[PDB]
């Protein structure tokens, strides 16, 4: 009767976090998460068998705490829908894109049946929608530009289109920004693939480098605003009008059932103000 399902999640700020587990091994308002950087499903199966085994499981390196937006959102959804969940920080941490045939990251893991539940800041793309199915969005955000302080209008300006001998950009290696840039104009796709970063929570230190490496970090607006708020020195700000308005959404296996109930629950929660409550609980405003 009790249905057990696995959950795949990255480490992306506000929406997700992490914490070193205590000696006793508990996490308040969070579940223990493993670190299996392997794509194969049989190892995941034996790892979870060890997790539920009576014999001692993998040591502390495969254990961590967690807390965040989607974590408690999924906690209440699962409490309503009468099931438990387990989480682990993927194997790649690279969202997903088309490369050498089979996809990568979350899309590759889901298409391979390693899990049945994907909760993160997952973006919305039509190309991803062709193969995988999406639910009702529970958020919406755009892309911005991060630059150290001391007038980039966005993408429609000559300062960025042609190379003015020393202007550099960069996004995540294969995020939704990469696909949109590639479908819009591939010359800039190549240009940033010259200097593209592998993950978001690295680009900020480039801006602390007295930047010769990176001078722009085009990415989603939510994490951008959070990194602006956490900037106590206030030496940075987002510039340029928003472009490519997108949305978020919980990922599901292709043609997987029980999507209607989840979408209706999300809609009802948004109507009743749970989303606003979590928004003001996690997303914090700091004057900068």
């Amino acid at each position: 009767s009790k249905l057990h399902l696995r959950v795949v999640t990255l480490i992306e700020h506000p929406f997700v976090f992490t914490r070193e587990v205590d000696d006793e091994g508990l996490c308040p308002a969070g579940q223990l998460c493993l670190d299996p950087m392997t794509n194969d499903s049989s190892t995941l199966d034996s790892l979870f068998s060890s997790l539920h085994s009576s014999n001692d499981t993998v040591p502390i390196k495969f254990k961590k705490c967690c807390y965040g937006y989607c974590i408690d959102l999924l906690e209440k959804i699962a409490e309503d829908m009468n099931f438990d969940f387990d989480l682990y920080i993927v194997g790649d941490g690279k969202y997903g894109a088309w490369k050498n045939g089979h996809w990568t990251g979350l899309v590759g893991d889901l298409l391979r049946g390693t899990a049945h539940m994907a909760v993160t800041s997952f973006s919305i793309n039509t190309a991803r929608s062709q193969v995988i199915d999406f639910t009702s969005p529970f958020f919406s955000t755009s892309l911005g530009i991060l630059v150290r302080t001391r007038e980039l209008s966005g993408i429609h300006d000559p300062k960025l289109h042609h190379p003015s001998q020393g202007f550099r950009f960069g996004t995540v290696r294969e995020s939704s920004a990469e696909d949109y840039v590639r479908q819009s104009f591939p010359e800039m796709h190549e240009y940033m693939r010259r200097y593209n970063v592998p993950a978001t929570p690295d680009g900020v230190e480039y801006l602390k480098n007295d930047p010769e490496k990176l001078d722009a970090f085009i990415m989603d607006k939510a994490l951008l605003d959070y990194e602006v708020s956490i900037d106590a020195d206030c030496k940075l700000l987002t510039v340029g009008k928003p472009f490519a308005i997108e949305g978020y959404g919980i990922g599901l296996p292709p043609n997987s059932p029980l999507t209607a109930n989840i979408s209706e629950l999300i809609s009802q929660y948004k109507s009743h103000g749970f989303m606003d409550m979590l928004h003001d609980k996690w997303y914090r405003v700091v004057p900068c």
Binding site: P137, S140, T238, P242, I245, G247
Partner: protein
């Protein structure tokens, strides 16, 4: 049939509510080109303050919209008795939440209930707001421009997107612009700030902007333009967005519908609408 009870509102230049004398009649006001201005006797509250229970003696109503109402009466052979709105809010979809039910307010609620239905006022044209009442062909278009104290680029500006403490911008409470600012999931960060400040009517926003307050103000195009015309201390700025048009309203399949739209389309041509726009709008000092 026959007798129709109509609902209006107070905002320049659509219907003034200047009180009459003790006798009951209304003094003869004069227009620019030597003609009498048509006016009607309209009953309603005496605002939130003063009075006994906001059921005051009749007042006088005359402006733009009243001329259109009189023309409709002439071309339709029917009689009216115009009365004002109980509260003054334009009317948005609201939830009491005491019975998990959706209920309107102001003009919308007083239309759906049925005690008065012609809503001759410049309401709005909206997708979901007009989803169970039938509008008519618009008689005037407008946009959602912003007025500031004597600059702002528009809705894409980091002062507008994030104030800190001294760039508060508000709008009138419980109206159409609130619906469109709430609906857009793309633009929903500012609305929370707008929940802090919101005024009951347009006059309060006028006094706020004039008296070293309300650094910004968002409202309809025509009212804002006439405001910045007559009052030579505030000027508008920012390009238009949400291009729509006003319109008369009726309940779902009321037995007039077609003839109202035919008359509106006919008067859109010839010289009627142009004459009304010339005599009731602008004539500015610059």
């Amino acid at each position: 049939s026959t007798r129709l009870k109509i609902v209006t509102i107070h905002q320049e230049p659509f219907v003034y509510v200047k009180p009459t004398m003790s006798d009951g009649t209304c003094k003869e006001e004069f227009t620019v080109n030597g003609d009498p201005v048509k006016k009607v006797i309209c009953t309603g509250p005496n605002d939130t303050s003063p009075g006994s229970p906001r059921h005051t003696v009749p007042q006088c109503c005359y402006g733009f919209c009243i001329d259109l109402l009189i023309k409709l009466a002439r071309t339709m052979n029917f009689t009216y008795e115009v009365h004002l709105v109980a509260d003054g809010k334009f009317g948005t979809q609201e939830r009491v939440n005491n019975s998990n039910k959706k209920e309107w307010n102001g003009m919308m609620g007083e239309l759906l209930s049925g005690q008065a239905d012609m809503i001759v006022a410049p309401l709005t044209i909206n997708n979901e707001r007009a989803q169970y009442i039938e509008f008519s062909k618009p008689f005037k278009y407008q946009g959602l421009t912003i007025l500031v104290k004597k600059r702002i680029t528009g809705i894409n500006d980091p002062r507008l997107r994030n104030p800190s403490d001294k760039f508060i911008y508000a709008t009138v409470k419980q109206s159409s612009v609130d619906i469109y600012f709430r609906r857009q999931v793309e633009l929903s960060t500012m609305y929370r700030h707008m929940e802090k400040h919101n005024y009951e009517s347009a006059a309060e926003a006028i006094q706020a902007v004039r008296d070293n307050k309300l650094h910004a103000f968002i409202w309809d195009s025509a009212v804002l333009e006439f405001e910045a015309s007559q009052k030579c201390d505030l000027v508008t700025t920012g390009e238009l967005f949400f291009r729509s048009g006003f319109g008369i309203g009726m309940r779902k399949d009321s037995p007039w519908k077609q003839n109202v739209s035919l008359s509106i389309l006919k008067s859109h041509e010839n010289g009627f609408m142009e004459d009304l726009d010339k005599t009731w709008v602008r004539y500015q000092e610059c």
